[PDB]
Enzyme design. Structure first.
Site, PDB file in Angstrom:
ATOM      1  N   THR A 195      -1.252  65.941  31.282  1.00  0.00           N
ATOM      2  CA  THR A 195      -2.311  65.022  30.863  1.00  0.00           C
ATOM      3  C   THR A 195      -2.160  64.574  29.417  1.00  0.00           C
ATOM      4  OG1 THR A 195      -4.709  64.624  30.843  1.00  0.00           O
ATOM      5  CG2 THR A 195      -3.939  66.759  30.016  1.00  0.00           C
ATOM      6  N   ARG A 196      -2.581  63.341  29.148  1.00  0.00           N
ATOM      7  CA  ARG A 196      -2.502  62.746  27.815  1.00  0.00           C
ATOM      8  C   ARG A 196      -3.819  62.074  27.441  1.00  0.00           C
ATOM      9  NH1 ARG A 196      -1.987  57.813  30.214  1.00  0.00           N
ATOM     10  NH2 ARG A 196      -2.526  56.532  28.390  1.00  0.00           N
ATOM     11  N   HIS A 200     -12.069  64.744  32.613  1.00  0.00           N
ATOM     12  CA  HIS A 200     -13.450  64.543  33.047  1.00  0.00           C
ATOM     13  C   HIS A 200     -13.655  65.282  34.369  1.00  0.00           C
ATOM     14  CE1 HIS A 200     -13.899  61.630  29.867  1.00  0.00           C
ATOM     15  NE2 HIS A 200     -12.877  60.932  30.330  1.00  0.00           N
ATOM     16  N   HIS A 203     -10.895  65.249  37.055  1.00  0.00           N
ATOM     17  CA  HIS A 203      -9.755  66.088  36.709  1.00  0.00           C
ATOM     18  C   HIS A 203      -9.995  67.546  37.033  1.00  0.00           C
ATOM     19  CE1 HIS A 203      -9.896  62.440  34.246  1.00  0.00           C
ATOM     20  NE2 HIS A 203      -8.645  62.353  34.663  1.00  0.00           N
ATOM     21  N   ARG A 289      -2.377  59.806  40.859  1.00  0.00           N
ATOM     22  CA  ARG A 289      -2.267  58.352  40.817  1.00  0.00           C
ATOM     23  C   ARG A 289      -1.709  57.799  39.500  1.00  0.00           C
ATOM     24  NH1 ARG A 289      -4.431  53.390  42.656  1.00  0.00           N
ATOM     25  NH2 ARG A 289      -4.837  52.089  40.803  1.00  0.00           N
TER      26      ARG A 289
HETATM   27  N1  LIG Z   1      -8.715  59.700  39.446  1.00  0.00           N
HETATM   28  C1  LIG Z   1      -7.507  60.256  39.618  1.00  0.00           C
HETATM   29  N2  LIG Z   1      -6.983  60.364  40.879  1.00  0.00           N
HETATM   30  C2  LIG Z   1      -5.767  60.923  41.105  1.00  0.00           C
HETATM   31  N3  LIG Z   1      -5.062  61.390  40.055  1.00  0.00           N
HETATM   32  C3  LIG Z   1      -5.520  61.315  38.774  1.00  0.00           C
HETATM   33  C4  LIG Z   1      -6.784  60.728  38.518  1.00  0.00           C
HETATM   34  N4  LIG Z   1      -6.980  60.783  37.220  1.00  0.00           N
HETATM   35  C5  LIG Z   1      -5.923  61.369  36.654  1.00  0.00           C
HETATM   36  N5  LIG Z   1      -5.031  61.697  37.611  1.00  0.00           N
HETATM   37  C6  LIG Z   1      -3.715  62.398  37.382  1.00  0.00           C
HETATM   38  O1  LIG Z   1      -3.883  63.399  36.336  1.00  0.00           O
HETATM   39  C7  LIG Z   1      -2.643  63.540  35.614  1.00  0.00           C
HETATM   40  C8  LIG Z   1      -2.856  63.287  34.104  1.00  0.00           C
HETATM   41  O2  LIG Z   1      -3.741  62.177  33.915  1.00  0.00           O
HETATM   42  P1  LIG Z   1      -3.599  61.190  32.658  1.00  0.00           P
HETATM   43  O3  LIG Z   1      -3.596  61.922  31.381  1.00  0.00           O
HETATM   44  O4  LIG Z   1      -4.638  60.139  32.675  1.00  0.00           O
HETATM   45  O5  LIG Z   1      -2.203  60.486  32.870  1.00  0.00           O
HETATM   46  P2  LIG Z   1      -0.723  60.762  32.507  1.00  0.00           P
HETATM   47  O6  LIG Z   1       0.075  60.963  33.737  1.00  0.00           O
HETATM   48  O7  LIG Z   1      -0.210  59.592  31.748  1.00  0.00           O
HETATM   49  O8  LIG Z   1      -0.740  62.133  31.630  1.00  0.00           O
HETATM   50  C9  LIG Z   1      -1.690  62.550  36.261  1.00  0.00           C
HETATM   51  O9  LIG Z   1      -0.887  63.171  37.282  1.00  0.00           O
HETATM   52  C10 LIG Z   1      -2.599  61.502  36.890  1.00  0.00           C
HETATM   53  O10 LIG Z   1      -1.973  60.658  37.877  1.00  0.00           O
HETATM   54 CA   LIG Z   2      -2.719  47.735  41.180  1.00  0.00          CA
HETATM   55 MG   LIG Z   3      -2.985  57.666  33.751  1.00  0.00          MG
END
Ligand SMILES: Nc1ncnc2c1ncn2[C@@H]1O[C@H](COP(=O)(O)OP(=O)(O)O)[C@@H](O)[C@H]1O
Ligand SMILES: [Ca+2]
Ligand SMILES: [Mg+2]
Ligand SMILES: Nc1ncnc2c1ncn2[C@@H]1O[C@H](COP(=O)(O)OP(=O)(O)O)[C@@H](O)[C@H]1O
Ligand SMILES: [Ca+2]
Ligand SMILES: [Ca+2]
Ligand SMILES: [Ca+2]
Ligand SMILES: [Ca+2]
Ligand SMILES: [Ca+2]
Ligand SMILES: [Mg+2]
Ligand SMILES: [Mg+2]
Ligand SMILES: [Mg+2]
Ligand code: NA
Ligand code: NA
Ligand code: NA
Ligand code: NA
Ligand code: NA
Ligand code: NA
Ligand code: NA
Ligand code: NA
Ligand code: NA
Ligand code: NA
Ligand code: NA
Ligand code: NA
Lengths: 510, 510
Positions: A195-196, A200, A203, A289
């Site tokens: 995560t970055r 919430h 998550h 996603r």
């Molecule tokens: N609403 C969601 N539904 C499915 N997967 C999610 C959702 N929100 C976040 N994720 C997943 O949580 C992980 C970390 O999220 P995030 O920090 O926003 O993205 P990133 O992959 O750039 O670190 C990722 O695998 C992302 O696809």
């Molecule tokens: Ca799209």
């Molecule tokens: Mg993302």
């Protein structure tokens, strides 16, 4: 599982009895020296601790090339993201194979000694297209052409010490350390969550489902190196993380910070993340996603498909040697007051709700309320704290060049006017006199919440020096943020225009 | 500092390649077996992990004797508290030196193999007088005569595994582990804080002054083994600890649970605590007012002087090899709204305030408010949670033997009456028929917050089986909690007496 390639390349451990010797060499008056850039400090730390196993230095042309066209190292080892030491022509010209370079940090701390194998000048267009999908707005492409050096220096590394860090001292576990952590607790199944952004409700629920589905403990492994420009700073996020971890049942999750420098390389990046997490000791890895995707370009088109990462990871399944726990868009269900994967609900006979990042960014900026169901209140508080609503934000008003009224008098008028509003903001007439040492402070003040009244513009050549955020231009020009009727417009008239503009933009609230 | 004796006796590490062998032996159909008692499981875990360095088994008569009369092991090593394996005459009679005993936990988990050196029958009176100061009410003395076996078995130990724990799995750091923790963070100065109660404002302030005075990081090292009967359970305390730790500045404190079995041996115990903490890697150790003391006996006299521990520790100063940070009574200052050592304020020109444990126990039991200045609200919430006010407490009414009215009818009357009050308590007419399997449940129900109506008394021989807390006797007897006027008193009259009694004691609130 075993680290990628089978051997954890913890070079700090490997080169322990060479430290004093390497140190002396790194500090000799004759060795070539290169001060690592921010992303390079992020990469070298993952190389020196075995996080990038099997890697033990920066990629040479042979390995680099294979990664670009093959998503594999020359020897066939699955590897999608190229990790290279990019330098400029000047430095490059002093390099010869067999040469030994001392790589420093902040021009003070000796990190490692690189033994040059080659010096090549990559074709940034191919890397852009083949590795990052070629869209110029893509974070990795922009960096590639705008920040990365034009010459790559391949070579093996010899560890002296990992980059220095004075914040979150015990939380940045190394692969060996984390592995020892899991072990002391007898955790033989751990699902890692990358995560970055802040975490919430969705998550927390998705990571718990993973823990339940995989029958494994939870590792919240957030990225604190480099992410996407515009992301929430890692300090605010670490706080968000430490807070949200208290919402999991006692003994189910572990937090460890990963000093990785992301590339926002969607699917390729996911494959890479899995390799990294495996090196760190994880048995399972979550891929939700749009994993590691940078969203859409200004034209509104997707950089990566919402599930491209999942599909690529799936195709490399029997090679990754780490179990992937895929997730479909996890959304909110009002009527059942709960979250769930979109693929498990009938988007026909059930209503869903979703506050997107954009939407959230917006609420935070207007001081709008964030649903109790969206995130935990402590999380939102921390976010608001470092991402204050407009009435708490800083700004700058610039007296355009077209202006014909007294700049001194208009400045004072704006100063005295803002002052009567009260409310806690600090105001100042800031004369930069085109001195960059001053121009570079404009954003520090805006960042501190202050309102700056700038008597005149700065040379175009210096424009880069200033952070455009919350910086408004008062001018007759069509391209002015606050457009004047005429350069000679009476001061009081201008003052009202500016006041109402700022009030219309949330800076002032009466 | 170096571990006491100079060598960390981590026998788990020492005997690693013997594990499978020791295990087989421990599980042979011919070896003598002893299932460790609770305190013994506490002691053995501190022996096997080097916490009791230099010890490597339970004290033999020679070492035991010297500790009792010399506060030193036979070889002269400073050691104040005797650690022995107390067994009964039956078991003792089967022991011969050279014999090997398998020490189990819960009759199922093999802990270690004891190699018998001797079997002696200690003079509990001397140990009571010399080590614990002889007051029969003293926690260690009562245990000594009422729980401890009459025969001690001295001998060396061979580790198989540390006692099993399914709660707070990663928090129970071993000396080696903790030492590794401090190290990975580069902590070369750590001040340890011992505790068996919840931490309030005074504690946070005192531990921070320590950290500042000593120029060292903070180790909150609470005891989760065995403390004083009546203490707050460790689960509630761990929660209190994990919460309060968030009140310290980021990165200054570490929490690690110590599975030590306290002796409440005031000064001697303090010396022992310092030795233990040194083994665990601490450079400084806090010793405040009445350290490890059990307060006063029923007669109101002190078991130890408020600073006996500090003085004893001071006299062993050059031997302990760990720095002691002594504190005078840390109290509250209303007018300056802050805490400070009593020895730093003029108790003449400045007013102080102090809510004692007794006082706190009382507020918690009445639902009284606890000053914002006394403890942090989250801490108090957790405390109230597991130490509920009377209106949430359980209880039991016993129809005395003298009773001459219908026990069945009086039972129902009390049941139906309690029921109308409402409020959430569960009620039941509990017939024990003198079956201890039932009598032993009475407190489980009281503990669950339920109100039990018990139709009649239980044999005196079975009295021990029942926990006297919140158990009231309804009888004509002068020694009845709710005294009846006569055994034949009309039911409705009795019912009112009981209702009003319970309402007068906070169980009912209208
Ligand atoms: N609403 C969601 N539904 C499915 N997967 C999610 C959702 N929100 C976040 N994720 C997943 O949580 C992980 C970390 O999220 P995030 O920090 O926003 O993205 P990133 O992959 O750039 O670190 C990722 O695998 C992302 O696809
Ligand atoms: Ca799209
Ligand atoms: Mg993302
Ligand atoms: N008000 C106080 N002033 C100075 N020291 C204190 C105070 N309260 C507690 N302490 C110290 O804090 C430590 C742990 O407290 P506590 O758990 O109550 O007792 P114990 O010493 O039995 O573990 C001890 O060293 C004790 O002397
Ligand atoms: Ca270029
Ligand atoms: Ca005009
Ligand atoms: Ca006896
Ligand atoms: Ca006293
Ligand atoms: Ca009568
Ligand atoms: Mg670092
Ligand atoms: Mg244990
Ligand atoms: Mg005390
Ligand atoms: Na494997
Ligand atoms: Na410098
Ligand atoms: Na696609
Ligand atoms: Na494999
Ligand atoms: Na599986
Ligand atoms: Na508008
Ligand atoms: Na020493
Ligand atoms: Na059994
Ligand atoms: Na005597
Ligand atoms: Na000192
Ligand atoms: Na005394
Ligand atoms: Na009363």
């Amino acid at each position: 599982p075993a680290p990628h390639g089978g051997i954890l390349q913890d070079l700090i451990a490997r080169d322990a009895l060479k430290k004093n010797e390497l140190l002396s060499e790194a500090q000799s008056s004759d060795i070539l020296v290169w001060n690592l850039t921010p992303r390079q400090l992020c990469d070298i730390e993952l190389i020196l601790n075995g996080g990038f196993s099997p890697l033990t230095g920066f990629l040479n042309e042979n390995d680099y090339s294979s990664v670009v066209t093959d998503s594999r190292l020359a020897d066939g080892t699955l590897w999608t993201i190229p990790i290279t030491l990019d330098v400029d022509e000047a430095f490059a010209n002093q390099i010869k194979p067999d040469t030994r370079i001392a790589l420093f940090q902040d021009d003070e701390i000796p990190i490692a000694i690189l033994t040059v194998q080659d010096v090549y000048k990559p074709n940034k267009t191919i890397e852009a297209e083949k590795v990052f999908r070629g869209d110029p707005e893509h974070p990795a492409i922009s960096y590639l052409f705008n920040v990365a050096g034009d010459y790559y220096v391949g070579g093996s590394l010899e560890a002296i010490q990992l980059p220095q860090h004075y914040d979150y001292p015990g939380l940045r576990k190394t692969p060996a350390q984390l592995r020892l952590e899991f072990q002391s607790r007898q955790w033989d199944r751990v699902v890692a969550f990358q995560t970055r952004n802040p975490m919430h409700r969705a998550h927390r629920e998705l990571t718990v489902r993973a823990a339940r589905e995989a029958n494994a403990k939870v590792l919240i492994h957030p990225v604190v190196g480099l992410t996407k420009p515009g992301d929430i700073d890692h300090h605010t996020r670490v706080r968000v993380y430490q807070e949200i971890i208290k919402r999991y049942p006692n003994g189910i999750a572990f937090l460890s910070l990963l000093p990785l420098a992301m590339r926002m390389s969607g699917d390729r990046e996911a494959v890479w993340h899995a390799i990294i997490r495996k090196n760190y000791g994880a048995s399972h890895f979550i891929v939700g996603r749009d994993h590691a995707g940078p969203g859409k370009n200004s034209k509104g088109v997707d950089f990566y498909g919402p599930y491209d990462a999942q599909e690529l990871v799936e195709s490399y399944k029997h090679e990754l040697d780490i179990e992937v726990v895929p997730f479909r868009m996890v959304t909110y269900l009002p009527d059942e007051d709960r979250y769930a994967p979109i693929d498990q609900i009938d988007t026909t006979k059930t209503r869903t709700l979703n506050i997107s990042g954009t939407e959230l960014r917006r609420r935070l900026r207007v001081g709008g309320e964030i649903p109790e169901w969206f995130s935990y209140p402590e999380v939102v508080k921390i976010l608001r704290e470092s991402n204050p609503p407009r009435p708490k934000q800083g700004f700058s008003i610039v007296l355009g060049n077209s202006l014909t009224v007294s700049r001194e008098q208009l400045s004072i008028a704006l100063l005295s006017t803002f002052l009567q509003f009260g409310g806690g903001r600090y105001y100042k007439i800031f004369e930069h006199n085109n001195k960059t040492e001053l121009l570079s402070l404009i954003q520090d003040f805006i960042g501190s919440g202050s309102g700056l009244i700038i008597p005149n513009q700065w040379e175009d050549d210096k424009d880069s020096v200033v952070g455009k955020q919350n910086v408004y231009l008062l001018d007759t020009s069509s391209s002015a943020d606050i457009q004047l009727e005429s350069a000679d417009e009476p001061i009081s008239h201008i003052v009202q225009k500016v006041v109402l503009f700022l009030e219309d933009n949330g800076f002032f609230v009466f």
